[PDB]
Design a protein around this ligand. Sequence first.
Ligand SMILES: Cc1cc2nc3c(=O)[nH]c(=O)nc-3n(C[C@H](O)[C@H](O)[C@H](O)COP(=O)(O)O)c2cc1C
Ligand SMILES: Cc1cc2nc3c(=O)[nH]c(=O)nc-3n(C[C@H](O)[C@H](O)[C@H](O)COP(=O)(O)O)c2cc1C
Ligand SMILES: Nc1ncnc2c1ncn2[C@@H]1O[C@H](COP(=O)(O)O)[C@@H](O)[C@H]1O
Ligand SMILES: Nc1ncnc2c1ncn2[C@@H]1O[C@H](COP(=O)(O)O)[C@@H](O)[C@H]1O
Ligand SMILES: N[C@@H](CCC(=O)N[C@@H](CS)C(=O)NCC(=O)O)C(=O)O
Ligand SMILES: [Zn+2]
Ligand SMILES: [Zn+2]
Lengths: 338, 357
Amino acid sequence: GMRVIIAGFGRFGQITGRLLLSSGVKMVVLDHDPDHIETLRKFGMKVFYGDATRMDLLESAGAAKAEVLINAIDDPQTNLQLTEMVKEHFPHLQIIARARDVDHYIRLRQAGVEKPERETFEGALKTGRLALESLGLGPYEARERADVFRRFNIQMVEEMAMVGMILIIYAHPYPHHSHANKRMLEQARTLEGVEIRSLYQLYPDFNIDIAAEQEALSRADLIVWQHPMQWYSIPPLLKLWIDKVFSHGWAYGHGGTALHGKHLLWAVTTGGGESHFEIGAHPGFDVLSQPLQATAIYCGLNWLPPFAMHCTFICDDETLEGQARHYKQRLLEWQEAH
Amino acid sequence: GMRVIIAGFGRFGQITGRLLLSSGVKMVVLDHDPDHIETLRKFGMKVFYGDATRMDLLESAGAAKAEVLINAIDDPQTNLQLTEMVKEHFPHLQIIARARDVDHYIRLRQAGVEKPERETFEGALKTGRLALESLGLGPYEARERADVFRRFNIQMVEEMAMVENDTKARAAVYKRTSAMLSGMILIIYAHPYPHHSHANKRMLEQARTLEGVEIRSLYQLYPDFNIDIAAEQEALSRADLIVWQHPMQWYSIPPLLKLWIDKVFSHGWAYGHGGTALHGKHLLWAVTTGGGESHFEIGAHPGFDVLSQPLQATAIYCGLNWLPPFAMHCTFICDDETLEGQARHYKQRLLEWQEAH
Ligand SMILES: Cc1cc2nc3c(=O)[nH]c(=O)nc-3n(C[C@H](O)[C@H](O)[C@H](O)COP(=O)(O)O)c2cc1C
Ligand SMILES: Cc1cc2nc3c(=O)[nH]c(=O)nc-3n(C[C@H](O)[C@H](O)[C@H](O)COP(=O)(O)O)c2cc1C
Ligand SMILES: Nc1ncnc2c1ncn2[C@@H]1O[C@H](COP(=O)(O)O)[C@@H](O)[C@H]1O
Ligand SMILES: Nc1ncnc2c1ncn2[C@@H]1O[C@H](COP(=O)(O)O)[C@@H](O)[C@H]1O
Ligand SMILES: N[C@@H](CCC(=O)N[C@@H](CS)C(=O)NCC(=O)O)C(=O)O
Ligand SMILES: [Zn+2]
Ligand SMILES: [Zn+2]
């Protein structure tokens, strides 16, 4: 109220709330514990007293208009009650819900909540990482092990609840803020046989699913690395995706022939024109492709001449559109030639 | 037993224990809940059934020999009781502890637990992120906002763990923190697996024998890719030579070093109007490669020296004085003589630089 209602403002709701408050989000918060209300007021937090399962209190908190309801109620039965009421009466109100445990998670999934958050799960993973670190594992390797286990465990719990092809690897860190690439992708979508995988949408925590990515690469004939140039090179997540996905025994080495015969296009946008690259011992835009070409060739790919969209610092929306067209044109040309 | 004791095998201790089983960690469990017996039997887990706070149970569990005790007990008083008993009787036993909330976190910090993990804290942040995404924020930008929130939140709770339990004091800290949220050599070391390194590890050992060297191991400091820009910029402010040291990966640099560049070389600090913080400083690329020079005969622009271009261009743009790279080649097929000698040469490069400045 205006945009978010938070039901329950104990330890869980408080942290969700304060994160949202930091971002300027306007909210209305309900909690049924009078002592919790007191302490929150001591810290200058505005919180309303009542049972969030009461329809009258939800309506006066603005449920008919709100965009998101955070269900931070601890008790499974009440938490589920709230979720079922909201689903029934407020069909546009997106519910993001805490789950006490796996049984509660399954129930919430079945009520139609997309990604219920088991309240101790991420804390218990962190504690596991700390135990690994104390036993002498490097923190990064320990984080990676926790990532593998999380992916495995979510798959398991999800199963319990149930019970001329072009692949564009897009790596813009801020897709919603893009002008040049966003337009390029709009134009590329109008083609047939184009899949787009936006790495920063898929893997905001830098935990690549190698098996998923290798499957998508299997189905592709042209692979495209599309991104804004950053510091004469590529974004961090794309470098991570290469390091992980182009794996020993798959992309290279004995038996690693998965990419043989496929083609790779570098599609990059820059803030300067060709003039900006006349610096250092090996000047010129084309020299910057070397590490990417070498990667591609090592793994048995065919490197295509890059598509380079120059001058974005000093460019208009007209020319941003002309270059988006040249991009679609490049891709179409590839497809017809194939 | 052999190395780890987990006290409590509820929702929390079960996840932590299951993660360690995937790492082949030897563990024994202290639990007193009849409903967990079958779960523990199914994993083949040795269990000492009873109150974990009992000295006789702890000794039977091997506490005098264990490296780590994971205190996953839910009840804050019982969890503190076990913490205190262990600190008193088993001086070498490292305690990793669950915390119920901020008051409990503070009490564990005061009992000498280094990094108590507030049980719902990371799950609530994830929830906060899913909300932000549902309001239209991109998942990556939403994660970054959670990282900034976390950094400040931990700072605030650490400040509170030094004041007294008194609410008005704690309240002041929160208000102050909430407002806030609304020839020296510096080696930036970026091996993803420092403990597994042979060549870089030896290079660092040698560099450590010089005077005025500081090493920041990025993958130790930031395993979650959440760089603290202010801490990095402070350390750069003190350095005269900056070294980027790492194993080469796919003809280029590791992801976390690229993130460090993208984040730390900020507009108005490293470049742009007023961005002169790096002017006068020097940069050395110090890189190890598996292949020899012959390995870089690939692509339209062959040869190792070409691969420095994006890095040299980055330096020049930020007003750094680029030095000739240090490159140790042939790690795949080099001996331990060649690998100790190359590391000595690294030390010689740094020393020679110190002599000229
Ligand atoms: C961290 C950072 C580093 C950048 N480095 C370069 C650079 O090396 N060369 C260049 O021409 N532009 C550089 N830029 C500009 C981007 O390439 C440009 O803003 C982008 O291509 C615009 O595309 P978009 O509208 O899709 O965001 C950089 C931008 C940022 C954020
Ligand atoms: C993901 C990955 C990519 C690599 N790419 C290259 C390569 O581009 N060229 C090369 O000569 N060595 C490459 N290597 C080999 C490493 O550079 C080499 O093993 C490392 O420098 C050894 O140093 P260390 O003993 O400190 O680990 C790569 C290694 C990994 C894991
Ligand atoms: N029906 C309800 N309406 C509003 N708040 C609730 C309800 N049931 C539980 N709560 C609150 O949910 C919060 C849960 O605490 P915690 O487990 O610390 O997040 C407490 O502050 C409770 O008062
Ligand atoms: N004194 C104790 N000794 C051993 N285990 C305990 C003790 N007190 C609580 N626990 C366990 O801690 C776990 C906490 O449950 P949960 O919140 O689900 O992680 C349960 O398995 C309890 O049996
Ligand atoms: N005594 C409580 C909760 C007390 C509480 O809500 N504490 C706040 C600080 S006033 C908290 O820990 N919020 C979560 C956090 O800040 O990490 C309980 O154990 O259920
Ligand atoms: Zn975005
Ligand atoms: Zn390591």
